[PDB]
């Protein structure tokens, strides 16, 4: 329904420039990307209308470049919204003096309700005042001048969910801006627990994935996908479905990524450090290099992807043999649609060896709602999913997408749907000739109330007692002999479109007798 990525081109400001690029993977149109200062999570920021220009290295993205030296009032926290159907979505980062006095040793922490956490800062620029700790821009506590540790710690045991946000650290006699910033995320439930009360369990997400506490699905680290984040996404690619490219010739050795709130921020997979400048020490591979290689039979270790199994083995650690699991592909979808306005049963077809199950198959209304399978066929290859809409109308005319998300990948394909309205004629028919046993009539129906191409015309008739009708019509002006003698008759015109809902009401109508 929405793929929103926040790119921080290095969160540590020097004299050179830094930049914030907010990327959306969407299409027709492009929901207005907000980028503003994040005044809530760090109060007392200095207010400045920041210029949101547009970015052109990608399909749709807006970027905020402060130019070298003018990197002044940029200290603070920031955000970008992307939204969907009444539902929002925002990703939060920070920007700070490279100098400053301290260094958060990590921009965000993802921790679960009731964990002991050690929120730190490396002590850099030693001065003869005290150290101080600020969350939400509200005061906490500090450190006397002479007993200032080397790693300024803050211990929080059994962290509650109302106990998180952005943390500061400065040398007392200082700016709310000379500080150093770290963000703390505490989810409603403990790890591997999610739901509106904590009574369900997460899709277990490998590769350092983080399990959303609202959906039980996983927000994957950049360069990995699936529901369980297990998928070795291509070289120098990121996102939900890994269709996006790192610009820089050495890949992502300076892009700090940032993800939907339940995750936080991190380097591309292959990069250790605060600036992602640092290569990963051998035997480690994940995002920040936080994943250790447990390759069973000694297969090479890749700083980008993990275990490089010998042919015929696959798995996190080459701990399983089997057919090489293939990522799904949405098959026999066309580019264009045009259906007529009524009940509607749309059909997604997806190949792949993980062979989708209707849990894993969805559809997205142009507005951005998720629709789930009302039934499931299947076959040998290709699971097949069928959906239903109440009445589909001409305002749902736009792009819709098939979402297939199995354990060894995610794919999406689109189709432009042009809902057309039914005909219905404008005018009554007009009567040409009367008589004892017959009548003749101008079928109106050249002025017609809707649109489309008209394919059959059917003639309707009744007395005043019951219903009947008919006659599939092949010239505009019509002759119904074999009639009674003196009845009141009622005549209605009824037009037709292209397949499915093509009936479409009649109104018109005159009356006669002989």
């Amino acid at each position: 329904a929405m793929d929103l990525i926040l790119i921080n081109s290095l969160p540590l400001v020097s004299d050179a420039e830094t930049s914030l690029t907010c990327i959306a993977s969407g299409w027709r149109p492009h929901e207005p990307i907000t980028i503003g200062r994040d005044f809530e999570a760090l109060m007392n920021q200095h207010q400045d209308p920041l210029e949101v220009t547009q970015d052109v290295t990608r399909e749709w993205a807006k970027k905020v470049v402060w130019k070298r030296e003018k990197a002044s009032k940029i200290n603070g926290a920031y955000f970008c919204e992307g939204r969907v159907r009444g539902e929002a979505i925002r990703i939060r980062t920070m920007k700070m003096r490279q100098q400053a006095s301290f260094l958060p040793a990590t921009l965000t922490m993802t921790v679960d309700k009731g964990d002991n956490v050690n929120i730190s800062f490396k002590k850099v620029l030693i001065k003869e005042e005290d150290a101080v700790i600020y969350k939400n821009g509200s005061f906490i506590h500090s450190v006397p001048r002479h007993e200032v540790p080397d790693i300024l710690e803050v211990h929080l045991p059994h962290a509650q969910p109302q106990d998180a946000g952005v943390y500061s650290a400065r040398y007392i006699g200082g700016n709310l801006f000379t500080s150093a910033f770290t963000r703390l995320i505490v989810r409603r439930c403990e790890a591997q627990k999610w739901g509106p009360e904590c009574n369900h369990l997460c899709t277990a997400c490998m590769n350092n994935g983080v399990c959303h506490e609202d959906t039980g699905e996983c927000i994957c680290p950049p360069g990995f996908m699936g529901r369980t984040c297990e998928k070795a996404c291509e070289l120098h690619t990121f996102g939900r479905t890994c269709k996006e490219r790192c610009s820089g010739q050495e890949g992502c050795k300076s892009y700090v990524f940032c993800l939907p709130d339940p995750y936080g921020c991190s380097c591309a997979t292959g990069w250790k450090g605060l600036q992602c400048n640092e290569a990963c020490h051998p035997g480690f591979y994940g995002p920040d290099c936080k994943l250790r290689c447990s390759c069973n039979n000694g297969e090479m270790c890749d700083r980008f992807q993990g275990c490089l199994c010998s042919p015929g083995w696959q798995g996190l650690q080459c701990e399983r043999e089997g057919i090489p699991r293939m990522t799904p592909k949405i098959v026999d979808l066309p580019d264009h649609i045009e259906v007529n306005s009524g009940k509607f049963n749309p059909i997604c077809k997806a190949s792949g060896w993980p062979l989708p199950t209707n849990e894993e198959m969805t559809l997205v209304k142009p507005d951005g709602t998720v629709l789930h399978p009302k039934d499931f066929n299947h076959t040998d290859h290709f699971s097949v999913a069928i959906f239903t809409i109440h009445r589909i109308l001409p305002p749902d005319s736009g792009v819709w997408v098939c979402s297939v998300n199995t354990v060894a990948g995610m794919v999406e394909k689109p189709f432009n749907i042009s809902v057309k309205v039914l005909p219905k004629p404008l005018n009554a028919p007009n009567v040409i000739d009367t008589g004892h046993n017959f009548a003749v009539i101008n079928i109106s129906s050249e002025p017609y109330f809707g649109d489309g191409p008209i394919k059959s015309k059917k003639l309707l008739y009744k007395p005043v007692n019951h219903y009947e009708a008919w006659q599939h019509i092949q010239v505009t002006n019509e002759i119904v002999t074999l009639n009674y003698l003196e009845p009141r008759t009622e005549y209605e015109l009824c037009v037709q479109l292209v397949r499915r809902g093509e009936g479409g009401e009649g109104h018109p109508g005159p009356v006669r007798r002989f």
Binding site: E129, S138, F139, I140, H141, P144, R145, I172
Partner: protein
């Protein structure tokens, strides 16, 4: 013609109350509050906080002569506390209490402060007591600061950050003359009435009371 509460107790008065002490080369007394129960009695109270009736955010001239009432919340006055610790050598105790109903005390063997041209500079020694292992007041001293005296060994202005008047290092680990915080606010407040090695930097305590009597008792 007696000059502190220890004399009041020598003279047989074993009850706590308001008394009047006259000071040497001080023409004109001061009503004070004498504490006669603690340890052995004979204590002379230089400041009392318990409710926050009184505002501690004041200037030199105000902190010089003292304010508040000896009955409820108060401060003695520095040209008094100075005028009293030049007569001899005094010991210092400090009576804390948080909101969960918990006494504590720091207690110091030597205590003296220099004059007005010396910024009532702090000179303590021998920190004992339940209020932390280490001394939450700085013993070696730096000068006394108020809202119109940047005297702290800090570069900022430590009066107008921690409120009132106290002995500010680069903002020391204490401020019993700060901001009175009621029950509930008393968590996570910084310019509060604090004492590090006891209840934590972000606490605002409940009932402080600083006091002196001479060594010899």
């Amino acid at each position: 013609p007696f000059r502190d509460c220890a004399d009041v107790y020598q003279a047989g008065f074993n009850k706590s109350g308001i008394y009047t002490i006259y000071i040497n080369n001080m023409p004109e007394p001061k009503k004070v509050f004498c504490n006669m129960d603690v340890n052995g009695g004979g204590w002379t109270v230089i400041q009392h906080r318990e409710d926050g009736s009184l505002d501690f955010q004041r200037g030199w001239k105000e902190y010089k002569m003292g304010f508040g009432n000896p009955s409820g919340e108060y401060w003695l006055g520095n040209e008094f506390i100075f005028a009293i610790t030049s007569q001899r050598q005094y010991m210092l105790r400090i009576e804390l209490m948080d909101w969960e109903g918990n006494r504590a005390y720091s207690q110091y063997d030597r205590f003296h402060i220099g004059n007005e041209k010396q910024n009532y500079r702090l000179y303590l020694k021998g920190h004992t007591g339940t209020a932390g292992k280490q001394s939450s007041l700085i013993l070696h001293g730096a000068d006394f600061s108020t809202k119109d005296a940047d005297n702290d060994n800090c570069m900022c202005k430590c009066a107008l950050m921690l409120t009132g008047g106290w002995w500010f290092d680069a903002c020391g680990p204490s401020n019993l003359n700060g901001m009175f915080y009621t029950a509930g606010q008393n968590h996570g407040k910084l310019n509060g009435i604090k004492w590090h090695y006891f209840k934590g930097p972000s606490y605002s305590l409940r009932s402080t009371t600083m006091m002196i009597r001479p060594l010899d008792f």
